Structures are given as C-alpha cells and as structure tokens.
Ligand SMILES: Cn1nc(Nc2nc(N[C@@H]3c4ccccc4C[C@@H]3O)nc3[nH]ncc23)cc1C(C)(C)C
C-alpha cells in the first residue's frame with residue numbers, strides 16, 4: 046500500500062489508543078510514543094503496536110503518517126522530524142473521522158440527544174448480536190478488538206472541523222437548535238453534512254423539530270422522518286408513563302404496530318428510541334432485539350439522569366442530575382422539565398464551569414438561569430483558571446436579581462447543600478443538579494442524606 | 498435505491514452520467530423531447546427511454562437527476578417533489594461518480610482541462626482506458642466500451658461548482674490558485690478543504706511554482722508531491738528547449754534517473770501540465786515508455802490555447818492562436834502565456850465579449866485586460882439570448898479603451914468578414930489570437946483556409 050506505518054505521538058492519550066487499536070485491526074503497522082508507560086501502552090503492545098517511552102526524533106523513523114494528540118507541541122522532536130521530511134501530521138480528531146471510510150458508518154448528529162441516541166443504537170445493535178464499535182466524547186468502545194464489527198456508530202459534533210468530512214452511510218439529525226450561540230449558517234452546515242451521504246445512503250430526520258422540517262426539501266437523499274408528528278414516517282403513539290418506565294407504540298411503514306418500553310422517563314427519550322428504531326429497522330434488526338435493547342437500557346450517567354425521589358413534608362421531590370454547563374444545554378434540560386412535568390416547580394442548583402466560559406457566555410447564562418422558579422447559584426468551578434471580575438456566580442446573582450423575576454441564592458463550593466436546600470423544598474418540586482465541577486457529587490449525597 | 502430517472506437524459510452531460518450508473522448496475526430511466534443516437538446508445542446499455550415529458554414517466558423512480566436546462570415546473574420533477582422523491586442536480590450526481598472509482602480530480606485556476614486530458618492520454622498509452630470529464634462531458638478512448646468501465650475516473654474540479662467540496666478523490670491536483678481580475682482567504686480555505694477530502698492515504702499533487710499553492714502547502718495534512726521548475730520541487734523540469742511546436746525537457750523524479758520527454762505543444766504552461774501528469778502516472782506505476790508516448794502524441798484540447806499554425810503574409814508568417822475564454826481572468830492568463838513564451842512578438846487580439854450582463858458586471862476588468870494587446874479587434878457582443886444593455890457593449894468598450902490614449906481598438910460586427918479586415922494590419926512575426934466564445938469559434942478555421950493567407 047501507499048501508507049503502511051502510522052505513528053501516534055502521545056498514544057496513551059484518552060482517545061488516541063482507541064484509534065490505534067482500530068488501525069491495527071484494519072491491518073496497518075502502528076507505532077506510538079508516550080512520556081509514560083501505562084496499561085494503555087501495555088494493551089496496545091499486546092495487539093502488536095511498537096511502543097516507545099520518551100520522545101526522540103527517531104521514534105518517527107519509517108512513519109508514513111503521524112497522528113498527534115492535542116497535548117503534543119509542534120517542537121516535539123517526532124513532529125519536527127516528520128515535518129522536516131514532509132511526512133503528513135494528522136490531528137487525532139481527523140484520524141477518528143477517517144475510520145468511517147472503512148466501516149458501515151452511522152453518524153448521530155443534531156444539537157440535543159446525540160449521546161443517548163448513540164448509546165441506545167449501540168445497545169439495540171448489541172441485542173441483535175452485532176457488537177458495534179461506538180464513539181462517545183472521542184472515546185471508542187465496543188462491549189474484543191475495537192473495529193472488529195462492520196458497524197461504527199458515532200456522535201457527530203457539528204462544531205468539530207472533521208464534521209463536514211465524515212463519510213457515513215447513515216446520518217441522524219435529532220434537531221437543529223441555534224439558541225444561546227447565524228442560524229442560517231447552522232442550517233446550511235447540516236444540509237452540507239447530509240449531502241456527504243451517498244445518493245443511496247439514509248438520512249434519519251426528526252420532523253418534530255421545526256428547523257429539521259424546514260430543511261427537509263433541501264436534503265436530496267433517501268429520508269425517513271420520525272417524531273410524534275402525524276406526518277412522520279415512524280411515529281410514537283399511545284405514550285404512557287409508569288414510574289421510571291415509558292411505554293409507547295411505534296408505527297413503521299409496512300409493519301404491524303410495535304409496543305415498546307424504555308426504562309428512563311421523558312418525551313426526549315421517546316424521540317431517542319424512535320431514531321434508534323428507524324436505524325435498527327432499516328438495518329433489518331428483529332422486533333425482539335429492539336424490544337430488549339430499549340427495555341434494558343439503563344441510561345447515560347449525568348445525561349438527564351433521574352435519581353429518584355427525596356422525601357419531604359407532605360410528599361416528595363424528583364431529583365434530576367445533568368452535567369451540561371453551556372447555556373444551550375441547560376436551556377434544553379429546563380425545557381425537558383417544563384414539557385414533561387408542567388405543573389412542578391423547578392428548583393435548580395447550578396455551578397458555572399470556568400471563569401472564561403462565564404465571561405464569554407455571560408448574557409446567555411443570565412437569560413437561561415433565570416428560567417428556574419428557585420435558583421441556587423454555586424461559586425464557579427475554576428478548573429485551574431484565575432477569577433475574572435464581573436464574570437462569576439455573585440455577579441450572575443445580581444444580574445438575575447436586577448430583572449425583578451427571581452432572587453437567586455448564592456452558596457460556596459464547600460457548603461453543605463442538603464441543609465441549605467431542604468427548607469426551600471416543597472412537595473411536588475423538581476430538584477435539578479446542573480453542571481460539572483463539584484455538581485457531580487451532589488445528587489448521590491442528597492439521595493443518601495438523613496434529611497431526606 | 499435501485500432506479501434512477503433522468504429528466505432530459507439526452508443532454509450532453511446527462512447521458513454520460515446515466516451510462517456510468519448503468520455500468521455500476523443501477524436501473525436507469527430517462528425522458529427526452531427527442532429520440533437520437535444518444536438515447537439509442539443508452540438503450541443498448543439497458544436504459545428505459547421515454548419520449549416527451551409527462552408526470553408518470555417518473556413513476557417508480559427512487560431518485561431523479563435533473564438537467565441544468567430543466568426546472569421545477571417539468572411535470573416529472575413536480576411529480577417527484579410532490580411525492581418526496583429526492584431530486585438531484587446533474588452536477589451533483591456527476592460528482593458522486595468518484596465514490597465508485599479511483600478518482601483523479603484536477604483542480605486550480607488555470608490548466609485543469611489540458612491536464613485532465615493529458616492524464617487520460619498518458620493512462621491510455623499504458624493500456625488503461627480511463628473515463629475522463631471535461632466541461633461536464635464524460636469521455637473514454639474508443640466508443641466500443643461503456644463509460645465507467647475503467648477503475649479510473651479523471652475529472653476537472655471547478656472550485657466555483659457547488660459539488661466541489663463533495664468530490665471524494667483518491668488523487669487531487671492543484672495547478673495554481675489565482676484570484677486576479679475578480680474574499681481571498683475564503684478561496685484558499687476552499688482549496689485546503691478540498692484537499693482534506695482526500696483520505697489520509699490519498700495523494701495531493703501541488704504546483705509549488707504557484708505562490709498561493711506554496712503558501713498553503715503546510716496546511717495539507719496528506720501525502721504530497723510538489724512539481725514545478727522550482728529547485729525545491731519534488732518533480733522538476735530542467736533543460737527545457739523549444740523546437741517549433743515541440744518542447745523538450747528532462748524530468749527529475751525522486752529515486753529515478755532523469756527522464757527525457759517531449760510534448761507537441763509550445764509554452765511553459767504545457768511543461769507544467771506535463772509535470773503534473775508525470776507525478777500521477779509515476780505514482781500509479783505507469784512505465785516510462787507510456788509516459789513518453791502519451792506526452793509525445795498529445796495534440797491538445799480544442800480551443801484551450803490551441804495553436805492552429807501559421808498564416809502567410811508579406812515577409813514571413815503570423816502564429817494563429819485560438820482560445821474560448823470569455824472572462825477577464827482567463828484572457829489575462831492567455832495573454833501572459835503569450836508574453837512569456839514569445840516576448841518579442843506583437844500581439845493582435847480578436848475579442849468578442851459574451852453576454853451583455855457579463856460585460857456590464859466585469860466592465861472595468863475588460864477595459865484593463867483587453868488593453869494588454871498591441872492591436873485590438875473588438876467584435877460586437879455575443880448576446881446568448883440576452884437583450885442589449887446600454888453602456889455595456891463593444892462600442893462602449895472601444896471608447897473606454899480609446900480614451901486612455903494607449904490603444905485604439907478596431908471595431909467590427911458579428912457578420913463581417915475578418916480575413917480582409919485583419920490581413921492589411923498583420924505584419925510578419927505577429928501573433929493573432931482569436932479570443933472568446935460565441936462567434937469566435939468559427940474564426941480561426943476560416944482564417945487558416947482563406948486565400949488571403951494561403
Ligand atoms: C492551457 N493552459 N495550461 C495551463 N497550465 C498551467 N498553467 C500555469 N500557469 C500559467 C502560465 C504559465 C506560464 C506562462 C503564463 C501562464 C499563465 C498561467 O499563470 N500553471 C500550471 N501549473 N500546472 C499547470 C499549469 C495554463 C494554460 C492557459 C494557457 C490556458 C492559461
């Protein structure tokens with residue numbers, strides 16, 4: 046072949062080793078360097094990678110192409126050597142996208158629901174004995190050597206530079222939401238992405254989303270729509286909720302109605318399931334596998350995870366947890382609560398992540414955070430950053446308070462939430478723990494706290 | 498998707514696409530106003546042909562391909578839309594073909610067409626028979642075989658086409674990136690993005706003699722082979738010598754002995770075309786003998802800086818050159834190619850503007866570029882179905898140029914006889930360039946067979 050040897054600089058990095066593993070599976074020679082030996086380098090060695098510890102120019106000798114992590118500098122002697130001798134140096138994210146050229150690629154795109162849908166697809170495919178390699182957050186998983194399956198299922202992030210270079214056989218678009226970020230450019234991006242499908246590929250489009258519906262005429266590829274919409278090709282009807290479990294019937298062309306459940310509440314998960322069913326159906330997966338895959342799906346950790354119930358005087362409070370820390374993600378979580386439980390008062394705990402992000406998206410935070418009925422704003426999680434005046438939780442409290450609708454309660458990172466929050470809570474409330482940093486710890490503690 | 502339906506399948510660019518899709522094993526139907534040898538040929542390859550347009554001709558199509566000439570009101574298109582059948586423009590489906598073959602995409606501002614054709618010629622000499630695409634038309638060597646039969650598909654890649662960034666080549670050429678006579682940052686990014694459509698194991702063939710290509714070289718994270726006269730080019734022409742219509746030069750390639758070649762077309766631009774072709778043929782494993790034969794017996798592409806030969810006048814002769822370019826930027830490149838190859842020779846240019854709209858839109862660029870000739874014969878605008886626009890015609894251009902004091906254009910009408918007009922002006926050692934489309938294509942053939950120059 047033209048290129049035989051692929052050399053990874055920083056091969057122990059979090060998403061690097063998965064790529065190396067699948068390239069070995071494809072039958073390339075793979076070498077890699079890292080500052081530190083680890084179980085990751087050990088594993089790659091057993092799969093037939095040549096590993097170097099330390100960086101020196103000669104580690105790249107005989108490389109046809111380099112792949113570098115974001116942690117690698119251009120003055121790294123291996124990179125420098127490759128450049129001096131005109132060897133191509135490819136970013137990790139670009140090589141990750143390239144993998145779909147070698148497999149039946151199912152790209153899951155859209156603003157909201159990509160991760161859960163990717164994971165659901167993988168679950169249903171597994172139920173039909175297919176063991177797909179799937180990609181979430183740049184990490185490759187399967188259940189075996191990564192890449193063995195003919196199937197590769199991956200989140201497709203529209204802000205990644207390799208998005209418009211993906212070559213899927215099947216593309217999902219869950220929705221196109223431009224809020225809290227032109228809108229016209231975003232639509233065009235999705236249209237262009239869908240045109241990377243072959244003329245015989247498949248676009249799986251949520252017609253419940255107004256913007257998806259709007260761009261439907263521009264797609265010019267085989268399309269299957271899904272949603273609650275009456276004109277959707279694949280439809281959920283007879284939706285009923287039973288504690289944590291949602292039941293519904295799915296209508297599909299030239300098939301009898303199919304009754305399914307999913308063990309995670311909210312209309313958003315019906316839509317996730319629908320997208321999965323379109324893809325499983327088109328792939329020829331049995332009704333039995335679909336039912337089992339959906340039914341026994343646990344959820345993705347801290348993706349609108351319902352932790353259950355806190356006991357208070359006169360009833361209970363539903364506890365919800367989500368790691369989203371961008372305004373657009375938070376707004377969607379809140380909308381999911383308002384849609385699913387329109388009568389229930391929303392008590393939100395929010396911690397901003399990073400001062401830079403708080404500064405950059407400040408006005409959007411003021412708007413979105415103001416949608417809560419009760420707001421507890423936790424001190425910023427710095428993630429190593431120095432404070433920025435006028436761009437912190439105290440300022441946000443003031444910005445929101447000034448608007449006359451809501452009076453946020455500020456608290457510090459070392460405070461104990463349970464005694465703070467319990468006196469505020471009333472039976473029928475929803476308590477949302479929202480953010481990363483210190484927030485992840487909270488819901489597990491609340492659920493095992495004496496006060497509840 | 499089993500059945501693909503073409504609306505206007507007898508169109509010059511439509512029939513080739515249909516033929517390749519048949520070859521790939523799709524069912525293909527198409528409609529056209531008129532039966533012809535074109536529809537007959539498609540029938541032999543298994544196409545179902547309808548004469549006339551009616552909605553039901555599209556019944557049972559999984560996808561439509563629509564000619565550039567045909568709009569949404571065509572009953573077949575309307576029917577497909579009403580029933581949510583995907584409607585693909587011709588240009589888009591053309592681009593799709595590369596996914597199914599070893600695609601060689603030839604991009605850049607200047608030299609795409611000749612290079613495409615040269616590649617095809619050299620591949621043919623090595624007993625390959627590639628399908629190749631020039632001006633949206635698909636061709637191969639020897640009409641026996643079915644378009645698409647070869648594993649190779651060579652095509653011009655035009656950066657202004659909407660499907661440019663959807664090409665999926667195995668090999669991509671960039672001849673040059675020139676923004677003259679027309680955002681520059683967006684243009685560069687477009688070419689970078691096109692090159693990134695290559696797989697990590699594909700090949701980029703880059704003309705480093707071009708400043709802008711050289712500039713973007715470091716952003717290409719793909720295997721690259723550079724070509725040019727530049728000393729640092731991977732593939733280099735040296736010892737360039739001209740012998741009438743024939744150019745000799747030696748080509749240096751990595752890990753190879755120098756290779757002596759000739760091409761039967763004058764000008765440095767054709768050395769560069771040859772170099773790009775040699776990179777590609779070499780990388781594909783084509784023999785030195787095939788390369789030599791392919792280059793040597795290459796005539797040129799019709800009306801792409803075509804040298805028609807010689808007109809006889811008192812005291813010697815006039816080199817007749819013909820080119821269809823009708824945008825200022827194309828004309829400027831032609832003139833620069835004449836000034837570089839023949840810096841001593843007086844340039845007499847016949848130019849006909851194409852369209853009143855284009856004349857209006859690019860007016861000042863025409864004044865500037867047309868003013869580069871030593872002698873200028875401006876022919877009346879070719880309308881191409883357009884109504885006249887006041888102030889945007891050849892008479893206005895004559896005045897705009899004449900007022901500047903350097904050059905005094907000679908106006909003539911579309912129906913005038915050029916030969917008696919031009920002969921008394923011509924002097925031995927002139928270059929006579931016939932430049933433009935419309936009525937211009939007819940001129941050089943007539944001049945060469947005219948008694949006045951016999
Ligand atoms: C037929 N044909 N073929 C071309 N091919 C290439 N032309 C150039 N450049 C050019 C050149 C070179 C020397 C003198 C003038 C000019 C002007 C232009 O700038 N660069 C190249 N790289 N690879 C190929 C190639 C160009 C052309 C013209 C004559 C139709 C424009």
Ligand SMILES: Cn1nc(Nc2nc(N[C@H]3c4ccccc4C[C@@H]3O)nc3[nH]ncc23)cc1C(C)(C)C
Nearest residue numbers: 157158161219251312313316317349377380381384
């Ligand atoms: C885990 N997860 N999964 C999602 N999946 C989808 N969410 C929506 N959209 C909307 C929706 C639907 C119901 C209630 C509220 C909202 C608001 C959201 O915008 N549309 C979809 N189409 N296909 C899938 C899908 C969404 C989410 C959240 C909860 C993290 C945002």
